[PDB]
């Protein structure tokens, strides 16, 4: 896990300053090391010289230099991939939902964006031997469509204590885009105290469509969304969680486009396009990824979460 | 119930400011807490610093942080589901029309969209023991097809005072889409004074098809509809009412599609597709839901509202 920011006191930082770094949202040594000098200057008590020392000492506790692709290939071969509860879907992702990265699932209505998030919320608690991440689940919800009964269904499938599964899912409802970003700062505080494997924002863009309604609010909208996505990457690098955001679609005027513009498209490393199949079956397509080929799969929404097409 | 916005005066807000929040449509502490900082800045007298204080104090009176799925499962197990007057239909919905959420019913003509709304308008006044919500009914009507005689029929079936039932249904007719949204702001004022269990917009999309006729008015149409649906979610979270909107259908060129595009589809948590059966019987299908399986039922339009198929 990451190093708590208290470890800066054993390096020459006044504990009164570590407390000021705390109110700014920094709870780990990594979060302070990854931060720019500019970000620390914006804090009240921190001066130019303090940030230089705080960054210098943080730099010693976490490596921020060059390595070889060999060492990076070795370290990545040990990365956790949480199972999607579907063999055919896990094979498409070559293991499952990859941690330390932002995965985005978009599609029409009913295509299973909320249903995959409820399956992932449980299967992240499974032992790694069974395809999990052995961590808690954080579910930031912006629509009100979080159903704990859908978690209990997935728990029964994997034979887990439904009461214990509901104890490892931290749930927050976001009511606007300012709140949605505010909830991520509290997320950083919690992820130090307990081990989390997966973070879910559902939907990451739903509230942006109506908080910034105007024509001239477009730049301010994409800028605020860019900061939210930048903060999700922070949590993914800091704690190694798997960030899974969902996205809504739109119609092509000149046939389904995800909303959020180029900001959401450049930021997400894996983009999953979900279509409606027949009955309860759905089709997941690799829409963008650094390592996976543009392919398709066929999963299903069953009475016990997302599984393989039962036919 | 929600806390009246007057409770902000006991927390450091000048009563002259609470009055300005009143003209902006905020009548509860929750509505102000759920609001963005941006929304309060757009008010005249409110400044940047005031909104910071107003939001800070509102944040203390209503919880906007993380909880556990256990606490949320417990709180949701106490949620009211209003009966549809049909055993076979209530079983499809696993209880009835769920409050604190947006339910949409669409279908062809005659399929019972207005008839279910008239049954729901009465059965929401029933005691919870009988399957109701023990609240008033609000019926925003955009077509002119509100018939109080259909309410009196449903009242006789449940043996309720027809005069008292008509006293608990607040009725407004909307003549265009601007008026339809304006009526929701007055709805927020009323729902503080009296207890309402159900809000009905029938039809929520009928007027959008002709207020925005052009080809280039499509974005402005869906944007205005997105704000209306965002405001319905506000009332559902603020007062815990059950929002039931209806929708019209269209033909597939390449066999019945609901109008409103992806905006209405992403926003509504439950979508009910109504078909014409034989005679007076109709078929309701779960078209989209976070928790209910894609199934069907068979209800009927009887001389006393929506009931079970009499055969």
């Amino acid at each position: 896990g990451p190093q708590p920011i208290s470890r800066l006191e054993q390096c020459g930082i006044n504990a009164n300053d570590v407390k000021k770094l705390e109110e700014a949202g920094f709870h780990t040594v990594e979060a302070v090391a990854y931060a720019p000098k500019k970000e620390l200057i914006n804090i009240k008590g921190i001066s130019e010289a303090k940030a230089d020392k705080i960054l210098a000492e943080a730099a010693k506790l976490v490596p921020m230099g060059f390595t070889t692709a060999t060492e990076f290939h070795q370290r990545r071969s040990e990365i956790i991939q949480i199972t999607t509860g579907s063999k055919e879907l896990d094979k498409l992702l070559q293991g499952g939902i990859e941690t330390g990265s932002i995965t985005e699932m978009f599609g029409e209505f009913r295509t299973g964006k909320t249903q995959i998030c409820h399956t992932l919320a449980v299967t992240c608690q499974l032992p790694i031997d069974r395809g999990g991440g052995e961590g808690k689940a954080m579910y930031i919800d912006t629509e009100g469509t979080f159903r704990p009964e859908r978690l209990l269904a997935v728990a029964e499938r994997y034979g887990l204590s439904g009461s214990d599964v509901l104890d490892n899912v931290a749930y927050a409802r976001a009511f606007n885009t300012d709140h949605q970003t505010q909830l991520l700062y509290q997320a950083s505080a919690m992820m130090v105290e307990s081990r989390y494997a997966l973070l879910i924002v559902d939907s990451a863009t739903a509230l942006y469509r109506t908080d910034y309604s105007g024509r001239g609010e477009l730049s301010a909208r994409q800028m605020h969304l860019a900061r939210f996505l930048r903060m999700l990457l922070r949590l993914a690098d800091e704690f190694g969680v798997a960030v899974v955001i969902t996205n809504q679609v739109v119609a092509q005027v000149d046939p389904k486009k995800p909303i959020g513009g180029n900001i959401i498209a450049h930021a997400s490393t894996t983009r999953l396009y979900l279509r409606k199949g027949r009955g309860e079956t759905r089709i997941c397509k690799i829409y963008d990824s650094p390592c996976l080929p543009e392919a398709e799969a066929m999963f299903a929404i069953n009475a016990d979460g997302v599984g393989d097409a039962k036919d | 119930g929600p806390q009246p916005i007057s409770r902000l005066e006991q927390c450091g807000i000048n009563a002259n400011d609470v009055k300005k929040l009143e003209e902006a449509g905020f009548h509860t502490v929750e509505a102000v807490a759920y609001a963005p900082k941006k929304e309060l800045i757009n008010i005249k007298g409110i400044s940047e610093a005031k909104a910071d204080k107003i939001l800070a104090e509102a944040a203390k009176l209503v919880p906007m942080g993380f909880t556990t799925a256990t606490e949320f499962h417990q709180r949701r197990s106490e949620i009211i589901q209003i009966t549809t007057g049909s055993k076979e239909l209530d079983k499809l919905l696993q209880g009835g029309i769920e409050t604190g959420s947006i339910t949409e019913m669409f279908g062809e003509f005659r399929t019972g969209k207005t008839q279910i709304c008239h049954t729901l308008a009465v059965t929401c006044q029933l005691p919870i023991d009988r399957g109701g919500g023990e609240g008033k009914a609000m019926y925003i009507d955009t077509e002119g097809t509100f018939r109080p005689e259909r309410l009196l029929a449903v009242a006789e079936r449940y043996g309720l005072s027809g005069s008292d039932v008509l006293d608990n249904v607040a009725y407004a007719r909307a003549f265009n889409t601007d008026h339809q949204t304006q009526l929701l702001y007055q709805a927020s004022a009323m729902m503080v004074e009296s207890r309402y269990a159900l809000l009905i917009v029938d039809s929520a999309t009928a007027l959008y098809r002709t207020d925005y006729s052009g080809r280039g008015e499509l974005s402005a149409r869906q944007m205005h509809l997105a704000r209306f649906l965002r405001m319905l979610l506000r009332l559902a979270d603020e007062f815990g009412v059950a929002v039931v909107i209806t929708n019209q259908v269209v033909a597939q060129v390449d066999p019945k599609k609901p109008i409103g595009g992806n905006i209405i589809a992403h926003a509504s948590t439950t979508r009910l597709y109504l078909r014409k059966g034989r005679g007076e019987t109709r078929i309701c299908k779960i078209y989209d839901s976070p928790c209910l399986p894609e199934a069907e039922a068979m209800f009927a339009i009887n001389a006393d509202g929506v009931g079970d198929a009499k055969d």
């Binding site: 608690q125 052995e134 439904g162 490892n168 509290q186 307990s194 | 919880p63 942080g65 993380f66």
Partner: peptide, 16 residues
């Protein structure tokens, strides 16, 4: 705020 049950550490879900 932080729920007192959300502050608790990850417990491995038992078998049922």
């Amino acid at each position: 705020f932080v729920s007192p049950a959300a502050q608790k550490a990850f417990q491995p879900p038992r078998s049922c």
